[PDB]
Write a protein that binds this ligand. Structure first.
Ligand SMILES: Nc1ncnc2c1ncn2[C@@H]1O[C@H](CSCC[C@H](N)C(=O)O)[C@@H](O)[C@H]1O
Length: 296
């Protein structure tokens, strides 16, 4: 109905499309930054065997527990853990939860990996956490702001603007500084490139960090993860929607359909959801061995 509701419907559609594209029956899923568990139920149709949700917010995990408790137990085991997925090794978080079945098949980071790019140390710790958790042949997928859209918008500001900002009725980005423009329209470093993000009734002016996708790809490769797909939300939706029209309920279709009959978003939610964000998927191709770790 409202632009922000259509954004939420669209992003939920994206997550269904992403999860069901790469997740297989029987998979063990590690959901990092799982929040209140809003995607827990999206794995049911995929037929997974175990969902491990980790989030740094104990309040969100408590709410995840409460929402799961009122649910009848699904066909998969659910493990919900309060823990820092980006600034600490995952072993600390999951050690009290021996039911976790590692190595897993899927690592999912939905709308959260960009918080790991606060520093190189945190970005590397997050990606090592992802890589070490996975089987060879496992997949790492997720959703982050598209650095190429961010660069496109940043490139429009003259160097004199001290705090480049843009948005529309439902979102706003405010960069901490103009170092990008002063640096001939390139980030001075891949990490800690901070902007405050506002999303109506979702994110209340919280700092987050650009994820220059070439750096995410380079780091992933260093830790044994090969890019399978990276697509802005609008192009991913176009690619997947032909197989999903029949799967969505009537109300779900109605909440995704435009007046010209196509499915997707228009208006302010078009930029806020379908341009601002990209999906990605990596496959683990080799086991990372820490440099100089093999001793006599
Ligand atoms: N270092 C960190 N470790 C784990 N979770 C983190 C984190 N930094 C941020 N988060 C979590 O990232 C989440 C972003 S909100 C997205 C929640 C969920 N993945 C969904 O798509 O609905 C929040 O729950 C926040 O607490």
């Amino acid at each position: 109905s409202s632009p922000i509701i259509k954004l939420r419907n669209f992003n939920n559609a994206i997550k269904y499309m992403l999860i069901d594209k790469y997740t297989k029956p029987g998979d063990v899923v590690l959901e990092l930054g799982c929040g209140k568990g809003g995607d827990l139920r999206k794995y049911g149709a995929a037929g997974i065997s175990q969902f491990i949700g980790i989030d740094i917010s104990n309040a969100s995990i408590q709410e995840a527990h409460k929402r799961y408790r009122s649910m009848r137990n699904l066909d998969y085991q659910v493990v919900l853990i309060t823990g820092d997925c980006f600034g600490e090794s995952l072993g600390v978080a999951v050690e009290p939860f021996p039911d976790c079945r590692f190595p897993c098949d899927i690592v999912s980071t939905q709308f959260c990996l960009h918080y790991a790019f606060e520093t190189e140390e945190k970005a590397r710790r997050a990606l090592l956490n992802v890589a070490k958790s996975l089987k060879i042949g496992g997949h790492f997928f997720g959703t982050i702001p598209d650095s190429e859209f961010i660069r496109y918008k940043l490139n429009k500001f003259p160097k004199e603007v001290e705090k480049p900002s843009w948005g529309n009725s439902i979102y706003k980005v405010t960069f901490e500084n103009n170092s990008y423009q002063k640096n001939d329209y390139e980030f001075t470093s891949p990490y800690g490139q901070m902007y405050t993000y506002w999303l109506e009734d979702a994110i209340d002016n919280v700092p987050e960090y650009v994820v220059p996708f070439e750096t995410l790809r380079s780091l992933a490769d260093e830790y044994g993860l090969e890019l399978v797909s990276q697509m802005p939300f609008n192009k991913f939706f176009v690619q997947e929607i032909p197989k999903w029209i029949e799967r969505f309920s009537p109300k779900m279709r109605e909440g995704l359909q435009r007046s010209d009959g196509r499915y997707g978003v228009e208006g302010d939610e078009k930029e806020a959801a379908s341009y601002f964000y990209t999906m990605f998927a990596f496959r683990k191709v080799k086991q990372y061995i820490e440099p100089e770790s093999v001793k006599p």
